[PDB]
Design a protein around this nucleic acid. Structure first.
Lengths: 108, 93, 96, 78, 96, 80, 108, 93
DNA sequence: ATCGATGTATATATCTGACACGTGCCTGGAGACTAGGGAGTAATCCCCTTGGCGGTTAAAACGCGGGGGACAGCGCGTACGTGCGTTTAAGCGGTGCTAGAGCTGTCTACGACCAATTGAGCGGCCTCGGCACCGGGATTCTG
DNA sequence: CAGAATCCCGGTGCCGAGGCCGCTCAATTGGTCGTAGACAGCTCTAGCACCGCTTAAACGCACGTACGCGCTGTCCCCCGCGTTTTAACCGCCAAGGGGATTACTCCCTAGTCTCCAGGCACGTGTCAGATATATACATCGAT
């Protein structure tokens, strides 16, 4: 009985491969689930999380803040052409709108 | 009783990207719902791909194809690259 | 005396409300409306405190987008005043 | 008749967030009807989920599911 | 000689093509266009006889719907002639 | 190649007539060609993706039906 | 051993209750399927099928034809304010369009 | 291989609604697609309704609720009566 | 060229409750072994996709005459925006009640899994009448 | 009100839809048994109701200017008709790439048992953000 070590440590990931494997089996998506599916899905979810957090953290500094809030997430998503396409139908509470005024309305 | 959320892993990622910034509980709730949404989208499409081909099992091929169908052109290339890197590191450990 | 010209205060209000994020409808009058509508489906219903907040956030997010669409179809006709037919055209093209 | 609780100033504030500079006098009564029609379609679904569970208290998740079914995913309320 | 006034024939064509049901784009040119676009994704592809017909039916339905939306945008400006900005407005409101 | 020019002016007029358009400006033709090309590209990318997952070399009607279904438009009469 | 009698004949339906129950089991929708589910679903599918075929047949009769064709199905669906709502995102091959002209375009 | 279809059942219904009328092959293909479409929509919502309540079994109540959520008002009003009558007669037999 | 009356923002000090961290412990992930059927490989059949020729009329390309539509300019009259004084009721802080959401325990009615039997419905064949095409006549509608 | 376009009627004729036969594999009847969920009882969270107070926001009025609308003019770009030409459509003949199926067997995943450490509630405390005050300096409208 060797000392147990997590699959995430073997793969080099922060997200939980075991929990993802459990959630796949409990969803009835198929009768069998292969060994590589949870490692691939965990890596994908970690990537998209890090990209969102990086843009939100940059938006926080531009406002001299030190804590991320929903407004920074909204500004991070709506200012990126790739993230805005993926999350076009999603509504974020307390996010507000982007500043925009049509040129026809400004003074002559 | 006992709940279950990703707040630990999200915080671990945050301290790698920006070790000087923190996150409010309201933002953490939105980040927690985001992962559940994308997880359900990918697992759904992978199940349809398996059903159309008349296969009983879900493999990395279904995940890779679902990612290529769901994610935009630039996000897809990077996501596929590191997914294959992770699988190769796991299988070579 | 002192008086600003028509339209400068409107632009200053636009710049004001696009920067803030608070809710703009009165909470208690909206809650009474939600209570009144639900009564047509079932009697003696109860509502959690967060359900009314979820409904209010969804309604305001819907109305802001509808006004954004209506303004473009007002400008297209070379006008600046929005009118009912602009809302009707936006809703017809949106399919709702 | 609580629809009158959605006052003219509140509608103007919503129009300002949307970037509208000048507003015609008939927009208010059109907007009240649009909102009244929108609310009913969400409440009917929320009550349907509440009744299936045999509960008497409408819950935030019932509203979240009602909105998602219409394509209006809301993030923040679990 | 006898000559019809401008627009008399256009209404007759509208009635004719609304009452009919056949496809309106030439088959060979469309088939070559489909085989040309596909070559960018994978080489030496082959196509079933029914896949091209499915694509043609989908494309013609899409274009007819877009023209139906564009005509409402033209009338809103009190014009009769459709113009590119009408297409751009319809596509913007549809969110394409 | 020149194959985009195969969508001639008369074909566009016939399509506009079915939609009820009475008078057409001379600049609509190039705009319609540009609108059509992006639609074809989007549907064909998905169809080829399904074809490649199956390891086939022929593109079948089902790949098209599934692609359209994913874009949010359903076609009746070809299968499924 | 008793003589077999089909479940559809017991319920009085035309659609196959056995095939529906089989499809419910093979689709992995859930791990258990109650005995009442397929009879209810078969009755609903039969109702909607007859509801459409009646209007299609009436359209075929008005055109003075005897065989139903896709044009008649399109005319049936698009003339009913409830069928058109359920089938709004569906395109029917060889269906064509409904005759309609804007009043502004007709001559004085 | 052998392919299943609903063609014979659709024809039996047609013979009940309009004995003198016939149907072409293309119309049959359309009807055969419409039936599978509605079948998958109802089974999908019944499945979601089961998971939200932690139930392991699909029952007539899940079908009835899915029908009330998917179909418009008058259609749902009639379809619920048809399903209730069918289940009642089946159980009484 | 500019003044001067309003407005938005910044800099300093004080407060408070939201966030980050440590502790106890329990239930869910990891290690080790067995059984069996799903997927991978190789070989065969044959069907339907790609390639070519001949030829005839349906459809596209090119000109031109003219008229009716799109666009700019002008006058006018009343609908909306800005600012003030009045009055309505939203927001908040506190206390009290009890309806009903969430949980544990018992147990019995339901659905899954096997085996033997046979008839429902799918594939191949026949055929005849619903539809479509040709030509000539009747009615409508427009310039 | 002459005449160009659409509809309809009588005759020909063919190949698509309606019906029959063979037959095999999917549905029914009968039995066992394990656990999912229906019912009863209890705890205690949080949804509903009432009160008093301050003052933020909504309401009603006046007034004057900037906008929406209707009319006139003109010029140029769409539409309708005719001639020429080019490449779409039909029909017939070849051949071979790739889809669909069968037979074998091996290696991947599901399942049971043990056991132990990852991460979930709970408690604490200190500093990031909210607020009041003062004032800097930018903008808009009239002279």
């Amino acid at each position: 009985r060797a000392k147990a070590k997590s699959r995430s440590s073997r793969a080099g990931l922060q997200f939980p491969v075991g929990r993802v494997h459990r959630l796949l089996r409990k969803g009835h998506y198929a009768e069998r689930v292969g060994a590589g599916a949870p490692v691939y899905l965990a890596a994908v979810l970690e990537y998209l999380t890090a990209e969102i957090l990086e843009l939100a953290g940059n938006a926080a500094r531009d406002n001299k803040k030190t804590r991320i809030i929903p407004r920074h997430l909204q500004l991070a998503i709506r200012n990126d052409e790739e993230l805005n396409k993926l999350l076009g139908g999603v509504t974020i509470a307390q996010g507000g709108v982007l500043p925009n005024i049509q040129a026809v309305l400004l003074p002559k | 009783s006992r709940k279950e959320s990703y707040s630990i892993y999200v915080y671990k990622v945050l301290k790698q990207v920006h070790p000087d910034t923190g996150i409010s509980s309201k933002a953490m709730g939105i980040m927690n719902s985001f992962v559940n949404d994308i997880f359900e989208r990918i697992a759904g499409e992978a199940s349809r791909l398996a059903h159309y081909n008349k296969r009983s099992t879900i493999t990395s091929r279904e995940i890779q194809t679902a990612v290529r169908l769901l994610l935009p052109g630039e996000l897809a290339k990077h996501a596929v690259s590191e997914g294959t890197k992770a699988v190769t590191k796991y299988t070579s450990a | 005396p002192h008086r600003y010209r028509p339209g400068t205060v409107a632009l200053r209000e636009i710049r004001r409300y696009q920067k803030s994020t608070e809710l703009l409808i009165r909470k208690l009058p909206f809650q009474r409306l939600v209570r009144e509508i639900a009564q047509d489906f079932k009697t003696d219903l109860r509502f959690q405190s967060s359900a009314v907040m979820a409904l209010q956030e969804a309604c305001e997010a819907y109305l802001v987008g509808l006004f954004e669409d209506t303004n473009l179809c007002a400008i297209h006709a070379k006008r600046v005043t929005i009118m009912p037919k602009d809302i009707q055209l936006a809703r017809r093209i949106r399919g709702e | 008749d609580n629809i009158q609780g959605i006052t003219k100033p509140a509608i103007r504030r919503l129009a300002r967030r949307g970037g509208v500079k000048r507003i015609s006098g008939l927009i208010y009564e059109e907007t009240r009807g649009v909102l009244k029609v929108f609310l009913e379609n969400v409440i009917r679904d929320a009550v349907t989920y509440t009744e299936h569970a045999k509960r008497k208290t409408v819950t935030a998740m019932d509203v979240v599911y009602a909105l998602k079914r219409q394509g209006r995913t809301l993030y923040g309320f679990g």
